[PDB]
Design a protein around this ligand. Structure first.
Ligand SMILES: Cc1cc2nc3c(=O)[nH]c(=O)nc-3n(C[C@H](O)[C@H](O)[C@H](O)COP(=O)(O)O)c2cc1C
Ligand SMILES: C/C(O)=C(\C#N)C(=O)Nc1ccc(-c2ccccc2Cl)c(Cl)c1
Ligand SMILES: O=C(O)c1cc(=O)[nH]c(=O)[nH]1
Length: 361
């Protein structure tokens, strides 16, 4: 239950015994069973997206792709859980190996390619705990569902629409993930006319759900967008009343300075080398949306400082994944404790007061 023991001994031993996909699969298993090693202060509570969040630190999509470990993840101390990406039909994703740790860079590269049990399997998994989730949500522990598309699908919009219909009624928020680096053509849905048409369809579908089963809809974007792309996304988001943005997915870039032997593997890069590219993207999106569109900031968060930098830049909430793969579950408590201490040090009454604070100086 100790940050040092996990960081110095448990995790490096795990890395020497198992390949990363296997270590991840085992992680999901242990978590699902609640076999895990902090008290949330009122300071960490945030109200956004039509919900209370008892703390602003969520688990990013990709860790629990199939909704198998939701309860274990709340136990781990996350203020909110996002599952997925989930695709309409089951699909296997890319051949293995398809995930790689770069320990010298505190980074991961992955090219899973949306391996997914599919909508029906995840629907029944969530239904089995639907009321337990209703209580968790009411208690300040919301659930997000991240929607993907099948590799061979002709009609991307219809895949997302199917996801809204099937998992929308079970989610506090949905994510239209148009930013995986590992599905051909996917990120091009980030363009203006394509995006407007896609999102109009998604929102129509969401609006057609009964009120108690009607989730917020967020769009998750890449860190690799052009200025024009970001400008266009901000315009469409405001035009359509999209509920929020998730900023960012992994990067296809390979920043100068990566040391890991595996740095030239194909896929999206996450962890520390992504951190500041993500923060700057949050900063840009917040400004372009006039601070009126909630942002979930993600990419390279491994400490309270990392979290607060994203919050100050415009994020109402943050998520992490890659940090867990190096530091294990104690990183969650660490981030929260550090964030609380920094908020006090910087004169903020709570997280809410810090949201977008850089933009006001
Ligand atoms: C192994 C792996 C798988 C991921 N799978 C997904 C995915 O299914 N859908 C998605 O929206 N993001 C996925 N992500 C991206 C994360 O949600 C997150 O945006 C990114 O890794 C940056 O955060 P981090 O640096 O804390 O890991 C994945 C990331 C990794 C490391
Ligand atoms: C490459 C890799 O280790 C991962 C990925 N992706 C990963 O998730 N690792 C990992 C391994 C064990 C754990 C873990 C889970 C439950 C209890 C204790 C631990 Cl160390 C976690 Cl939270 C993450
Ligand atoms: O390969 C995936 O499944 C995947 C990886 C990633 O980094 N981001 C994403 O949205 N999907």
């Amino acid at each position: 239950g100790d940050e040092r023991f996990y960081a110095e001994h448990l995790m490096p031993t795990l890395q020497g015994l198992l390949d990363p996909e296997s270590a991840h699969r085992l992680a999901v298993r242990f978590t699902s069973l609640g076999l895990l090693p902090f008290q949330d202060s009122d300071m960490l509570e945030v109200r956004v997206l039509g919900h209370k969040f008892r703390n602003p630190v969520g688990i990013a999509a990709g860790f629990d792709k199939h909704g198998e470990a939701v309860d274990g993840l709340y136990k781990m101390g996350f203020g909110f859980v996002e599952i997925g990406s989930v695709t309409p039909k089951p699909q296997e994703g890319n051949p293995r190996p398809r995930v790689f740790r770069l320990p010298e860079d505190q980074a991961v590269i992955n090219r899973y390619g949306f391996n997914s049990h599919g909508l029906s399997v995840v629907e029944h998994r969530l239904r089995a705990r639907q009321q337990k989730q209703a209580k968790l949500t009411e208690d300040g522990l919301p659930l997000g569902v991240n929607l993907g598309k099948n590799k061979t699908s002709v009609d991307a919009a219809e895949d997302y629409a199917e996801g809204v219909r099937v998992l929308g009624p079970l989610a506090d928020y949905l994510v239209v993930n148009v930013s995986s680096p590992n599905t051909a053509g996917l990120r091009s849905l980030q363009g203006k006319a394509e995006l407007r048409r896609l999102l109009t369809k998604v929102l129509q579908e969401r609006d057609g759900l009964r009120r108690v089963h009607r989730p917020a809809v967020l769009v998750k974007i890449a860190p690799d967008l052009t200025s024009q792309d970001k400008e266009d996304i901000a315009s469409v988001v405001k035009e359509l009343g999209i509920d929020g943005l998730i900023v960012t997915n992994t990067t296809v870039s390979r920043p100068a300075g990566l040391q890991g032997a595996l740095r030239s593997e194909t896929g999206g890069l996450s962890g520390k080398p992504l951190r500041d590219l993500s923060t700057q993207t949050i900063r840009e999106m917040y400004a372009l949306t006039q601070g009126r569109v909630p942002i979930i900031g993600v990419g390279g968060v491994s400490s309270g400082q990392d979290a607060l930098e994203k919050i100050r830049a415009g994020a109402s909430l943050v998520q992490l994944y890659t940090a867990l793969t190096f530091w294990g579950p104690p990183v969650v408590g660490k981030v929260k404790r550090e964030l609380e201490a920094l908020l006090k040090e910087q004169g903020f009454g709570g997280v809410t007061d810090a949201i977008g604070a850089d933009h006001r100086r």
